[PDB]
Nucleic acid binder design. Structure first.
Ligand SMILES: [K+]
Ligand SMILES: [K+]
Ligand SMILES: [K+]
Ligand SMILES: [K+]
Ligand SMILES: [K+]
Ligand SMILES: [K+]
Ligand SMILES: [K+]
Ligand SMILES: [K+]
Ligand SMILES: [K+]
Ligand SMILES: [K+]
Ligand SMILES: [K+]
Ligand SMILES: [K+]
Ligand SMILES: [K+]
Ligand SMILES: [K+]
Ligand SMILES: [K+]
Ligand SMILES: [K+]
Ligand SMILES: [K+]
Ligand SMILES: [K+]
Ligand SMILES: [K+]
Ligand SMILES: [K+]
Ligand SMILES: [K+]
Ligand SMILES: [K+]
Ligand SMILES: [K+]
Ligand SMILES: [K+]
Ligand SMILES: [K+]
Ligand SMILES: [K+]
Ligand SMILES: [K+]
Ligand SMILES: [K+]
Ligand SMILES: [K+]
Ligand SMILES: [K+]
Ligand SMILES: [K+]
Ligand SMILES: [K+]
Ligand SMILES: [K+]
Ligand SMILES: [K+]
Ligand SMILES: [K+]
Ligand SMILES: [K+]
Ligand SMILES: [K+]
Ligand SMILES: [K+]
Ligand SMILES: [K+]
Ligand SMILES: [K+]
Ligand SMILES: [K+]
Ligand SMILES: [K+]
Ligand SMILES: [K+]
Ligand SMILES: [K+]
Ligand SMILES: [K+]
Ligand SMILES: [K+]
Ligand SMILES: [K+]
Ligand SMILES: [K+]
Ligand SMILES: [K+]
Ligand SMILES: [K+]
Ligand SMILES: [K+]
Ligand SMILES: [K+]
Ligand SMILES: [K+]
Ligand SMILES: [K+]
Ligand SMILES: [K+]
Ligand SMILES: [K+]
Ligand SMILES: [K+]
Ligand SMILES: [K+]
Ligand SMILES: [K+]
Ligand SMILES: [K+]
Ligand SMILES: [K+]
Ligand SMILES: [K+]
Ligand SMILES: [K+]
Ligand SMILES: [K+]
Ligand SMILES: [K+]
Ligand SMILES: [K+]
Ligand SMILES: [K+]
Ligand SMILES: [K+]
Ligand SMILES: [K+]
Ligand SMILES: [K+]
Ligand SMILES: [K+]
Ligand SMILES: [K+]
Ligand SMILES: [K+]
Ligand SMILES: [K+]
Ligand SMILES: [K+]
Ligand SMILES: [K+]
Ligand SMILES: [K+]
Ligand SMILES: [K+]
Ligand SMILES: [K+]
Ligand SMILES: [K+]
Ligand SMILES: [K+]
Ligand SMILES: [K+]
Ligand SMILES: [K+]
Ligand SMILES: [K+]
Ligand SMILES: [K+]
Ligand SMILES: [K+]
Ligand SMILES: [K+]
Ligand SMILES: [K+]
Ligand SMILES: [K+]
Ligand SMILES: [K+]
Ligand SMILES: [K+]
Ligand SMILES: [K+]
Ligand SMILES: [K+]
Ligand SMILES: [K+]
Ligand SMILES: [K+]
Ligand SMILES: [K+]
Ligand SMILES: [K+]
Ligand SMILES: [K+]
Ligand SMILES: [K+]
Ligand SMILES: [K+]
Ligand SMILES: [K+]
Ligand SMILES: [K+]
Ligand SMILES: [K+]
Ligand SMILES: [K+]
Ligand SMILES: [K+]
Ligand SMILES: [K+]
Ligand SMILES: [K+]
Ligand SMILES: [K+]
Ligand SMILES: [K+]
Ligand SMILES: [K+]
Ligand SMILES: [K+]
Ligand SMILES: [K+]
Ligand SMILES: [K+]
Ligand SMILES: [K+]
Ligand SMILES: [K+]
Ligand SMILES: [K+]
Ligand SMILES: [K+]
Ligand SMILES: [K+]
Ligand SMILES: [K+]
Ligand SMILES: [K+]
Ligand SMILES: [K+]
Ligand SMILES: [K+]
Ligand SMILES: [K+]
Ligand SMILES: [Mg+2]
Ligand SMILES: [Mg+2]
Ligand SMILES: [Mg+2]
Ligand SMILES: [Mg+2]
Ligand SMILES: [Mg+2]
Ligand SMILES: [Mg+2]
Ligand SMILES: [Mg+2]
Ligand SMILES: [Mg+2]
Ligand SMILES: [Mg+2]
Ligand SMILES: [Mg+2]
Ligand SMILES: [Mg+2]
Ligand SMILES: [Mg+2]
Ligand SMILES: [Mg+2]
Ligand SMILES: [Mg+2]
Ligand SMILES: [Mg+2]
Ligand SMILES: [Mg+2]
Ligand SMILES: [Mg+2]
Ligand SMILES: [Mg+2]
Ligand SMILES: [Mg+2]
Ligand SMILES: [Mg+2]
Lengths: 142, 97, 152, 129, 24, 79
RNA sequence: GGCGCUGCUGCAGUUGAAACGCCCGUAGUUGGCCCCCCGCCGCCACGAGGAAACGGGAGCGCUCCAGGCAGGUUGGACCCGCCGCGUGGGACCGCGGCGGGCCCGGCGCGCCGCGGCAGCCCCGAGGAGAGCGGGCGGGGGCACCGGUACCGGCCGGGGACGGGUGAAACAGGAUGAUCCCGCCGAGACCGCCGGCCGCGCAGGCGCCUGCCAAGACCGCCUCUGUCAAUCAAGGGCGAAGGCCGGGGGCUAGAAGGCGAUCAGACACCACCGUAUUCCCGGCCGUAAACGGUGCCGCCCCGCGGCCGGCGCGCGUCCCGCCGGCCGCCCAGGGAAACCGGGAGGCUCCGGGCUCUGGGGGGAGUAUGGCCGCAAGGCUGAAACUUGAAGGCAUUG
């Protein structure tokens, strides 16, 4: 019957499911424990760090552009990341020592769109929300 | 690549392995049940002189001897020398000689 | 049958009559076919061949219909049943024959294959007889010792 | 080897009716098969049958009148409390109004309507509709 | 590459690694 | 035409395999033969493959053949 | 949750990812039919006993409401812990000498055969094993043995080229080749017949004669009495190439050498040739080891061919039965090609058992372990990367 039947086979039916559960990439990513170790944010929604550089990144094949990003050192584990800055003209609030709050792009650690090697993005600069800085609701000191 | 023929291109029924023959044109190795096989009976002298040998023969009641040859070729040599042709999908089912 | 140790699938077998009664021409009583059975067992005839002889000479289709018991049971009732049942004995005989053939021919792998099959069947049947109390609990088939037990 | 004689009987009957046959032979017979055919008869899905003796496992000859949409068994025979019957009714049956799930209980073999009429449970053996 | 020759290449690679790790 | 499976015609039932009949039964039977030189008569199985002798003779009077058996110089019956 | 993309209900495994090369076999899982009205499990029902809050739920206008337990004789009813305990059922699923009198309230314990009992065997599977008869077949092992051919040598003859290719060149020849005929040696091989023939567990299997053990099928009024199915661990066999130690050595021929071709040719084509190819004793354990289709069991419109055994009929045939190998094909199935002796009887989903897969890469890699003389084999990740890869089919 391609599966075992019979009134006394509960142990086998449970062993098979336990073994074949690991064959799914989603389950293996969320349950094995290697992704939690390798995750730069250590399983958190966001993380703060200091900017070490400003950079421009080429887009992928069918598009043509220079995307604006920053290399960031993490406070809590001293890892190296790169984070994207959205919203036209926003790369002008980022001095080379500016505490930044950084979150993900969505897709839970996968690159999106046309930016090669980018999985994070800046949401706050030196204490102030970057979106409200673009919408002209608050301003930086000087 | 789906399956092209029900016989898989050979005549092998209820056995594991069959004998090897050498193609008579190029000498490659072919299994015996796949090789193209033809039998020929011909005269040793060509028909265009078959009456001049006969009229210049001293023995009374002589009969021209014959030759018996079984020719066996591989698939490539059979197609190249036109012993068999590439056929339409419908025509491939025909076994008539 | 011919299906435990091959891909046979044959169905050749015998089918016995529905009516369970003596023959119209049956003169014999149970006490006089038990006589012939015991004379044939004393003479050394195995129980499967006794039925053949009674069928072919004495015109008796089934012994059960004329007596009410079976051949091996009658032998057991008169103390003339064998120590080892006939089928296990025949399998041991065939194993001894194949081993003795293999002693001269060490390059015969087909015979080694069939020897394995026979001995597996022997062990399974020996276990059946042992747990059924038709054989001593210490019964064991031993390949090396099997030639001289056939004498006893 | 042969394990579920009732399963083979019901497959044979469904095949024979799908062809459009009047009679069908099923072998071997058994007490359970006779109980199942008796229930099918009493609901009106089959006509007369006959068990023929052969000093062995017998045969059965079944007469067919074209009323059987489907018949099957449930293996293994799971046990069912009184309150799970309906969670099985909307699983196997084409509706809540016709069809029959057959249970064995300590009060005999019976369909599900009588099983909730006597408010008891049992073990499922099959279904027809 | 034809997979047979890729397998040949990989076997030569693994044998080179075993030989280099044999030292020390 | 309307056959009933519960009462099959015996003639077309004898031509089927002994096991797939409605009620399985044997194919063989017994029969009487007369010794070519003795007045008496003996009863013989139809599918014998074991020696069968005369009451007087010491020559075996049957030939096993893999099916129904043949006999040497004797004349037979059916009962 | 979507997601039947984790599938017990309920997935997929011919070709998309996926049936171990094959046979044996322990643990495990599963196991035909039959006696009813006893015992012991399981199972179903109803009880007893233990906590509230939460969750359900009877009644009530905090103005409604999330709430709360209120209130105008009252009320806060009831249900929900559990593989244990008690009562009942008993379909389904298993497992299993007696009386009387001594004797006396019972039970044991022995004592008398005392004359009371029908004293103490379902059946014989279109399960299986054993038997006897009969044919059947490139099934296996050992010894022996014929035939031409390829190669090599020798005698005689005769006298200019022979070989090789698409065309040529290197090899050969007045030391007489090539060619013709006779004689000799050695080692391989087994043609035509040779097949929609046949055999074996698969890998595989073809000269003569002799010996040896086996096998499936058929036939049967022979014997036994469930002795079975599938199988982690474990055991055995396993094309070719390859390895160790001996032997042999014709042919072909990895490597190597050499003549052409070509821009180049270290290749394809020509010529010479080492290991190897063959025998013996071991090792290795892999193939598109393919029907790309695991094993056992049931039902299943038909028309044909061939192989083995048996039976009836006429006068070799002819009609059946069983077992095997094939072709076509209604229904049904399917993404289709196609299958149809299943790939059917399946979203109308449940006969039993074992194995494998879960987008494409990285990768069958790193690492550890076991095995191997080695070459290997078996077991076998992660970081990271990517929007498709793939199947079958249509037109150009
Ligand atoms: K499946
Ligand atoms: K499945
Ligand atoms: K399974
Ligand atoms: K069970
Ligand atoms: K699974
Ligand atoms: K393809
Ligand atoms: K082919
Ligand atoms: K064949
Ligand atoms: K063949
Ligand atoms: K041909
Ligand atoms: K070819
Ligand atoms: K088998
Ligand atoms: K068979
Ligand atoms: K069969
Ligand atoms: K052996
Ligand atoms: K053995
Ligand atoms: K065994
Ligand atoms: K064995
Ligand atoms: K056993
Ligand atoms: K055993
Ligand atoms: K003995
Ligand atoms: K490959
Ligand atoms: K490959
Ligand atoms: K390879
Ligand atoms: K028949
Ligand atoms: K018959
Ligand atoms: K007969
Ligand atoms: K899901
Ligand atoms: K779900
Ligand atoms: K769902
Ligand atoms: K499936
Ligand atoms: K293919
Ligand atoms: K793959
Ligand atoms: K694969
Ligand atoms: K693949
Ligand atoms: K498999
Ligand atoms: K496996
Ligand atoms: K196995
Ligand atoms: K096995
Ligand atoms: K077994
Ligand atoms: K086992
Ligand atoms: K067990
Ligand atoms: K199991
Ligand atoms: K079990
Ligand atoms: K079973
Ligand atoms: K219960
Ligand atoms: K019940
Ligand atoms: K409390
Ligand atoms: K009161
Ligand atoms: K209990
Ligand atoms: K109780
Ligand atoms: K009780
Ligand atoms: K008392
Ligand atoms: K023979
Ligand atoms: K044959
Ligand atoms: K032969
Ligand atoms: K042979
Ligand atoms: K042979
Ligand atoms: K041999
Ligand atoms: K031989
Ligand atoms: K010769
Ligand atoms: K010779
Ligand atoms: K010249
Ligand atoms: K040779
Ligand atoms: K022949
Ligand atoms: K033939
Ligand atoms: K032949
Ligand atoms: K043959
Ligand atoms: K043949
Ligand atoms: K034949
Ligand atoms: K043959
Ligand atoms: K032959
Ligand atoms: K016979
Ligand atoms: K078994
Ligand atoms: K099974
Ligand atoms: K097995
Ligand atoms: K194994
Ligand atoms: K193993
Ligand atoms: K081998
Ligand atoms: K090999
Ligand atoms: K070698
Ligand atoms: K050589
Ligand atoms: K040699
Ligand atoms: K080589
Ligand atoms: K070369
Ligand atoms: K090259
Ligand atoms: K090339
Ligand atoms: K050469
Ligand atoms: K070599
Ligand atoms: K050599
Ligand atoms: K070779
Ligand atoms: K050789
Ligand atoms: K090998
Ligand atoms: K493969
Ligand atoms: K193939
Ligand atoms: K399997
Ligand atoms: K024939
Ligand atoms: K025939
Ligand atoms: K045959
Ligand atoms: K024949
Ligand atoms: K025949
Ligand atoms: K025939
Ligand atoms: K048949
Ligand atoms: K058949
Ligand atoms: K047939
Ligand atoms: K077949
Ligand atoms: K398996
Ligand atoms: K597998
Ligand atoms: K596999
Ligand atoms: K696999
Ligand atoms: K390693
Ligand atoms: K080693
Ligand atoms: K070494
Ligand atoms: K070596
Ligand atoms: K090594
Ligand atoms: K190594
Ligand atoms: K290794
Ligand atoms: K594709
Ligand atoms: K593919
Ligand atoms: K592809
Ligand atoms: K493919
Ligand atoms: K299509
Ligand atoms: K398509
Ligand atoms: Mg088996
Ligand atoms: Mg069978
Ligand atoms: Mg028979
Ligand atoms: Mg028969
Ligand atoms: Mg789901
Ligand atoms: Mg033979
Ligand atoms: Mg081995
Ligand atoms: Mg070996
Ligand atoms: Mg050579
Ligand atoms: Mg050479
Ligand atoms: Mg492999
Ligand atoms: Mg394979
Ligand atoms: Mg395979
Ligand atoms: Mg055939
Ligand atoms: Mg065939
Ligand atoms: Mg076919
Ligand atoms: Mg799996
Ligand atoms: Mg390693
Ligand atoms: Mg290792
Ligand atoms: Mg399409």
């Amino acid at each position: 019957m391609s599966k075992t039947s019979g009134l006394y086979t509960a142990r086998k039916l449970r062993t098979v499911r336990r073994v074949n559960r690991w064959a799914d990439k989603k389950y293996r990513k969320a349950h094995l424990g290697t992704w939690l170790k390798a995750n730069p944010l250590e399983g958190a929604c966001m993380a703060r760090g200091i900017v070490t550089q400003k950079i421009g990144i080429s887009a992928k094949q069918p598009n043509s552009a220079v995307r604006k990003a920053v290399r960031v050192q993490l406070t809590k584990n001293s890892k190296k990341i790169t984070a994207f800055v959205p919203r036209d003209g926003s790369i002008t609030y980022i001095d080379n020592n500016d505490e930044v709050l950084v979150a993900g792009f969505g897709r839970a650690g996968r690159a999106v769109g046309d930016i090669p090697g980018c999985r994070f993005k800046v949401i706050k600069v030196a204490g102030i929300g970057l979106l409200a800085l673009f919408l002209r609701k608050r301003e930086k000191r000087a | 690549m789906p399956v092209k023929r029900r016989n898989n291109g050979r005549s092998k029924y209820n056995c594991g392995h069959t004998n090897i023959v050498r193609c008579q044109n190029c000498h490659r190795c072919v299994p015996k049940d796949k090789v193209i096989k033809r039998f020929t009976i011909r005269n040793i002298v060509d028909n265009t002189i078959a009456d001049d040998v006969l009229n210049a023969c001293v023995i009374q009641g002589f009969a021209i001897p014959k030759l018996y040859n079984k020719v066996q070729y591989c698939v490539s040599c059979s197609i190249h020398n036109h012993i068999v042709r590439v056929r339409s999908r419908e025509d491939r089912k025909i076994r008539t000689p | 049958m011919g299906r435990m140790h091959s891909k046979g699938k044959g169905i050749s077998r015998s089918a016995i009559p529905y009516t369970r009664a003596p023959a119209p021409w049956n003169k014999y009583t149970p006490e006089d076919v038990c006589e012939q059975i015991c004379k044939l067992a004393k003479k050394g005839t195995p129980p499967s061949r006794i039925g053949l002889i009674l069928r072919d000479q004495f015109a008796i289709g089934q012994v059960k219909n004329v007596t009410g018991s079976k051949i091996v049971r009658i032998l057991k009732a008169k103390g003339l049943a064998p120590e080892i049942p006939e089928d296990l004995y025949c399998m041991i005989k065939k194993a001894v024959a194949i081993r003795k053939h293999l002693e001269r021919s060490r390059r015969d792998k087909d015979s080694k294959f069939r020897l394995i099959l026979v001995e597996s069947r022997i062990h399974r049947l020996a276990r059946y007889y042992r747990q059924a109390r038709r054989l001593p609990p210490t019964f064991r088939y031993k390949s090396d010792q099997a030639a001289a037990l056939l004498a006893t | 080897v042969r394990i579920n004689v009732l399963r083979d009987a019901l497959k044979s009957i469904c095949n024979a009716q799908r062809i459009g046959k009047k009679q069908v032979i099923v072998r071997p017979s058994s007490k359970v098969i006779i109980e199942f055919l008796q229930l099918m008869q009493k609901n009106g899905y089959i006509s007369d049958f006959a068990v023929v003796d052969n000093h062995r496992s017998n045969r059965i000859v079944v007469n067919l009148i074209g009323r059987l949409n489907k018949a099957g068994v449930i293996s293994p025979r799971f046990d069912i409390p009184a309150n799970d019957i309906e969670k099985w009714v909307v699983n196997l049956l084409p509706s809540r109004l016709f069809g029959h799930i057959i249970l064995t209980t300590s009060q005999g073999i019976m369909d599900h309507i009588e099983a909730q009429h006597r408010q008891i449970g049992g073990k499922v053996i099959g279904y027809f509709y | 590459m034809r997979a047979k020759w890729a397998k040949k290449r990989m076997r030569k690679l693994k044998r080179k690694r075993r030989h280099m790790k044999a030292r020390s | 035409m309307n056959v009933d499976l519960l009462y099959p015609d015996p003639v077309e039932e004898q031509r089927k395999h002994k096991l797939k009949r409605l009620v399985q039964g044997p194919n063989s039977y017994f029969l009487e033969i007369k010794c070519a030189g003795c007045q008496d008569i003996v009863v013989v199985y139809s599918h014998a493959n074991t020696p069968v002798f005369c009451p007087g003779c010491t020559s075996q009077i049957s030939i096993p053949t893999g099916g129904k058996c043949a006999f040497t110089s004797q004349v037979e019956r059916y009962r």
